[PDB]
Symmetry: C4
């Protein structure tokens, strides 16, 4: 099951735009980007391979002329993140939470960043789906950008799904920047998350599967082709920019519709 | 999956009409037709066969008695379509939009700014009636509305009957349902995923003036002799009055007051 | 195989008010009191089956059509034929059947239907005995039921569903029962089609049918068991009816109308358009 | 199919509590308990009593053993007053197994007494008592009668010839149905509880406590007593863990947790 499968976008028959005028650019964490998707790193042979495709493809890469941001677990003290930032000069700091993966100081550390840190920073949930309450909390600390990342061992089906968390977070989007990740397989999933209102979409699982299957050159090729697919899809939806996608009509089916129809 | 399978017609137990008084005629593209369904590089053989059944069975087809219409892509200039009309003197012109088909085609159209221009020229300059036809993905309401605004009188809403995109578009029933608010502003024609006369009746109930068949017709000629296909087809005209008798409807138009129920995905998509 | 009764759940009642033996199974329709709320509808041989069916009805104390006896006639027959049936047999009532789709899907099936309404009008106008208008297999719609009401018909059997592409034409028994509820004060409703067991029977009764007729189920029974065993199974069904009714806390057939139920799936979908 | 699987709890990414702050205590039938789940019960009862005593759990049929005793409502008030006298339990549980008895060829056939018997307890018994359904789900009407009869605690025990063996309502469905009565009576949940997440779900739906039976029988059937004790004790940490992820400090606060309903359960709620 992938929640994006429960979403249908309304096709538009009479196109207004040439394929080449389609604008793929977006903005978050105080930065303009050429492309609305990016790469989150994973052994270390993998991450080198990924930094390679990001650089050639001109994509942000979240851990030379490579658009760079750094990640740190919120379990670490604030000084550790401040130092990561000083040493690396990333576009921004991303701090992640994995409650259930873990299952205290976390909110202390979070507090410390929101107030002290001068560079833009992002709070990232790690796959369990970030609930509205937590989104509101972050907003109240003055967090400007969150990665909403959604989906004994009777508990491992825990958490909300990506699409579902994106839908719930919709009322808050005029107050915070939303980033989606988790369960994104291809450019249609990407377009879906954007339609739902994410500023951009982080890729993880898919990228690793690609490098495990394809050489870096092949992946670079695949990823650049994905750029085309994005334009193609948006042409078909009659949208000339990334922002216009937020006006695309869509339909919910199955569990996703159920979840929104209580 | 076919979306018509998610529609249930309410049958009527005590009939008022005999099987032989049921009226099958309809009207669109400025023409009267006796029947509410019609037919849409070797290839050229299959089309000889289809034209044959059409002429014989009295169906529109898209032989001086053959009721013919001709098709052209909207990517062509208005002038090309006009040549077509002048050349073949068809009942009407059918202009197709196949955006997604083009986009997925390696050698396909890549620029579309002109499509709207071409469409405008037809609505305002073409004498003969024309139909704007979608090719397979389901014509959305916004497109329909624009057409209406440009002065288009008839549309074929043709819905769904890398590989991650192969389920793009809306289903036929679904597009007919969405289009219902505009059915008094433009003529709706149905096509895509029409298997049999029950699908035909369903499309008409939802409010289409008529229903085009394609795939089903290949399938038939692809496993029967013209003579035998003409048989099934004429017999479909008898399935139509039969179905209609049991729905207690005496004319095509009356089918729009047949009560029905929606189930599953089709109902889901209609109740957001 | 889909059966719409399976889309209905009855709300159990934990704390019983009644003893099992006081549960009353008696009902009333077409001007007759009957001991039980289910009856049998008959099938060239053929005759052999109907012999067996009549023997279980007689022994089990059940109404049998066509001993508690009623007669059936196709509505394509002229009224006088129905009249002579009543005169000759002295049945409890006359059941007149319509089978439109069945006639349509049949080569020889009489394709002229103009006379059915005429004949129905004739029976309403001339026939003293109560008579039932009975759909055959496809579900009687609210429009037909209302027309019956207008003609003076007091009882209908709404008999729902329980080339090939028309093989699933028509409404399911449960669905037709639900559609008919708003008319249940103006006409008596009988259910048939797709009744497999006493729980199906209870469900139909809850939905508001006065009684339910069995057809295919009876045929299946005599095909698998001796007549003795069928009699045993059927009398056992009586106890099942009381048992279920006890569990629901309903002491009479009429009280089943007050039983809470939930709808699921297609059946629920059918009521949430 | 288990009805709890149609319920999704809305979790909380950044908590407010540690696992040590989580209060697991509850109260019903006049008694404080340190834990919100308990055991419903011969050689197997032998073992189950040893797990309960050692784990500090209520045990409904060892001076430290928190004991309660069960009796069928088909018994006259005399037999139940005896039970209390003989065993000095924390409370008496009176069960109603209507459908079970109807499907028993030797089972009860008269029932008019049951409501009489219930009212006697309601009038003659000093010791608190619980009215317990056995497996088929206690319906709103029956609960309302208990209320009017003065009964203060019920176990709503839900689902979780053969055409009848899906009779009754599921545990979660009966919980949902009973909600409007949760300020008028104590609701105990049982029937198809597999693990601590089912426990939490029942508590969130508003039960004061969750009773286990089948699972317990399986555990002492697929394990040794000591293991079972380790198993149940581990369940206690799971409860705090879930409650932390849900950001709840007490059992009570569970009723403010947000949830979504799917499938059959949602369908039953939208008629």
């Amino acid at each position: 099951y992938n929640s994006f499968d429960d979403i249908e976008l309304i096709h538009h028959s009479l196109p207004d735009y040439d394929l080449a005028e389609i604008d793929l650019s977006t903005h978050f964490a105080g930065q303009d980007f050429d492309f609305p998707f990016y790469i989150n790193a994973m052994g270390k042979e993998v991450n080198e391979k990924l930094a390679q495709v990001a650089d050639t493809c001109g994509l942000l890469f979240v851990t030379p002329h490579l658009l760079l941001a750094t990640n740190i677990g919120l379990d670490k003290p604030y000084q550790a993140g401040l130092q990561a930032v000083r040493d690396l000069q990333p576009l921004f700091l991303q701090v992640h939470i994995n409650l259930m993966q873990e299952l205290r100081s976390w909110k202390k550390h979070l507090s410390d960043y929101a107030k002290k840190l001068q560079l833009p920073f992002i709070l990232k949930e790690v796959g369990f789906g970030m609930d509205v309450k937590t989104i509101q909390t972050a907003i109240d600390l003055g967090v400007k950008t969150v990665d909403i990342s959604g989906r004994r061992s009777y508990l491992n089906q825990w958490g909300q799904t990506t699409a579902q968390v994106l839908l719930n977070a919709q009322p808050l989007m005029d107050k915070v920047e939303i980033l989606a990740s988790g369960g994104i397989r291809h450019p249609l999933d990407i377009i879906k998350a954007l339609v739902l209102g994410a500023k951009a979409v982080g890729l993880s699982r898919t990228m690793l599967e690609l490098v495990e299957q394809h050489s870096v050159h092949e992946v670079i090729a695949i990823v650049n082709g994905w750029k085309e697919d994005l334009r193609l899809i948006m042409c078909a939806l009659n949208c000339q920019t990334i922002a216009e996608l937020r006006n695309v009509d869509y339909l919910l089916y199955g569990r996703l519709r159920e979840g929104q129809r209580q």
